[PDB]
């Protein structure tokens, strides 16, 4: 170790003092080099007082890229360290973290949760690597610095310190933890009554600021309703549902005392940020009591304040197809005459209110909602806003959210597409990251694309869903095709992968759902797989595949398969990315889904098992092998010869010849596969088989013990395809240098007679065949010199 101990040295030195120059940054992202896990390289930048020495140089720095380089460094040294994360908690406090979030310039907020990730991770036993759990054990260990690190965080929520790109990525990273149940932070979280405080978020208004008022961003409401939501979804028992929805009312009855224009106004936003949050809680919360009325009644007045906050309620009330039908009742009149109002905020809040009220339920009678050209009306009122260059304003987010119901008919979808300068407007809406129009702007783009979740009609005998089929079904029905892929074309082209990327920050799993439905959209044209590799779209989808719906997981997966198909995993899924992306592709093979989506992922895993030896290691250790292999057994055209040729390039690991090894048919069918219709399929197993007798005396002896195996050596021999041939010849050869005896059972056939048939003859289209089967003669000649 005696190299590295000096270079660290070298390093450390040319970054801390303010001599070198840009000289700094090259020691800098070097720096962070060294440690990266490597022990050896860490344990030393700590020792010589490292952490010190960051601490000193951050609060003065001013080169942003030495500066990020620096708290990397901070999270290198504490990754899957106990001790250095809690001596760095100590030397540094969690409030040192909290400031690099607070710092207003560019890629701090990233970073800043990297650490604190990666410290909450050291402490849990948590590894940042896919479906990791926390070890049970090292979070008693560590339960005061864990706990003391969830308190640190709720206690900035509503900190009025620090600005909103901050309170966001706070939130964010409270949302990203609170699953783990080692860690029970959802459960720790509502004791110190975290919820009142994420509500408090919620209801900061960012037009008008009362007195006591807090710095947020446009994403904040959002952003702190999916912590509100996913807190929920973490009450277990019905007790602990409890304990919530009691904070939450409890939260409510206070504000609703002293009920001055203030604390009424916030009350609403609030009650509206938590429907669009836990729904539930929220509608228990309206029910108990005429805030429905007291909704109304803000509605009904004369401040244009209370109408736009009251709106966004009744729109937000609606989410119910029951509760729905129940409030057009009273409210339905209201919003017809706000939608007549010259406050364009207001407008267009209730043009939102009505066509929400008015997509129920566009299924049943099979009639479609807003006929007789309503749609196209409203639509059109839609385009306006979204247009409007005289309010550069929000009112854009909400024209979006209207054509999210619009655009289920399909002449809105066909006028929409062909109005370039709305499609722009949607676009740079997604592409300014809002989090607060995600809903609309990617429900309007799943639906030009039809995206949406179809009607799903299901076998009776699940088991036979593959069998024998001899083609894939059209994902659409051919008329609509074209039409349909012309639109995604054009949303392609207008740059949609960096847009949704942009606002893929989200941690919604439904929010998810809907970017993973438009991408995997997109992907389902080869020639835009391309453009979303190149826009950043793996990375998001990886991210989509590993955590989300059910649904969306496996969009997202699916994307990916294509992706794989078209642009070479070596390329589109370097370097950790191959291996992260095994295990949601496997469940692309279950039976359960579609004979497309086993098909993709039939291919990207065939794409896949032929980088390295370490992309086909993790394929089995998840039970690949096995989940690959069932498809042999259909007669599918297709899925079986995916199957084989993905099974060919298996073989390259020994871990896999050993299990054709085994007790067990693997080399009883692969064999039988042989003399399989479609070349295609009968080649890659040829091939495979030839791979594994070349190296497995045991597979040459398992042959041998196949009912009839000389029928099937004979078929191979004078095989119609020159390539399957040249594969079966060469299986003949490495079975004949096996072993004396596999040799003898071999000589004993009229098979040595065909062979001295092939004789040499370089330019023959059966050159290849004729040279192996020359050799394979010329070994049974050393066997009889003896």
Known sequence: NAKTSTKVKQMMDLTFDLATPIDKRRAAANNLVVLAKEQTGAELLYKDHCIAKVASLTKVEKDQDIYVNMVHLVAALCENSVERTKGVLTELGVPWFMRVLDQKHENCVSTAQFCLQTILNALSGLKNKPDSKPDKELCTRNNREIDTLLTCLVYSITDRTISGAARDGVIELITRNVHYTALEWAERLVEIRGLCRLLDVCSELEDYKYESAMDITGSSSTIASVCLARIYENMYYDEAKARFTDQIDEYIKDKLLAPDMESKVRVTVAITALLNGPLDVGNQVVAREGILQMILAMATTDDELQQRVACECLIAASSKKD??????????????????????GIRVRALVGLCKLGSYGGQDAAIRPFGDGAALKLAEA????????????????????????????????????????????????????????????????????????????????????????????????????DFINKRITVLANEGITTALCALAKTESHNSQELIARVLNAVCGLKELRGKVVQEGGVKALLRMALEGTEKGKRHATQALARIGITINPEVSFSGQRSLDVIRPLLNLLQQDCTALENF??????????????????????????????????????????????????????????????????????????????????????????????????????????????????????????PAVQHRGIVIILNMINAGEEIAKKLFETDIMELLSGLGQLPDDTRAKAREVATQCLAAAERYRII
């Open 600 to 721: 993709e992922s039939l291919m990207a895993l065939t794409n896949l098992a032929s980088m390295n030896e370490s992309v086909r290691q993790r394929i089995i250790k998840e039970q690949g092998v096995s989940k690959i292999e069932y498809y042999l057994m259909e007669d599918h055209l297709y899925l079986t010869r995916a199957a084989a040729q993905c099974l060919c390039n298996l073989v390259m690991s020994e871990d896999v010849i050993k299990m054709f090894e085994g007790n067990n048919d693997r080399v009883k069918f692969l064999a039988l596969l042989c003399e399989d219709e479609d070349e295609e399929t009968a080649t890659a197993c040829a091939g495979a088989l030839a791979i594994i007798t070349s190296v497995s005396v045991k597979c040459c002896e398992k042959i041998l013990a196949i009912a009839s195996w000389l029928d099937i050596l004979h078929t191979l021999i004078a095989n119609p395809s």
């Open 323 to 344: 509760k729905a039908k129940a409030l057009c009742e009273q409210g339905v009149d209201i919003l017809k005459r706000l939608y007549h109002s010259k406050n364009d």
């Open 382 to 481: 839609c385009r306006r806003f979204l247009i409007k260059p005289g309010k550069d304003k929000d009112i854009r987010r909400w024209a979006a959210d209207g054509l999210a119901y619009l655009t289920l008919d399909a002449e809105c979808k066909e006028k929409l597409i062909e109005d370039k300068a709305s499609i722009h407007a949607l676009m740079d809406l997604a592409r300014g990251g809002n989090q607060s129009c995600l809903y609309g702007v990617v429900t309007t783009f799943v639906n030009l694309c039809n995206a949406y979740e179809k009607q799903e009609m299901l076998p009776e005998m699940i088991e036979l869903a593959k069998f024998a089929k001899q083609h894939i079904p059209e994902e659409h029905e051919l008329d609509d095709v």
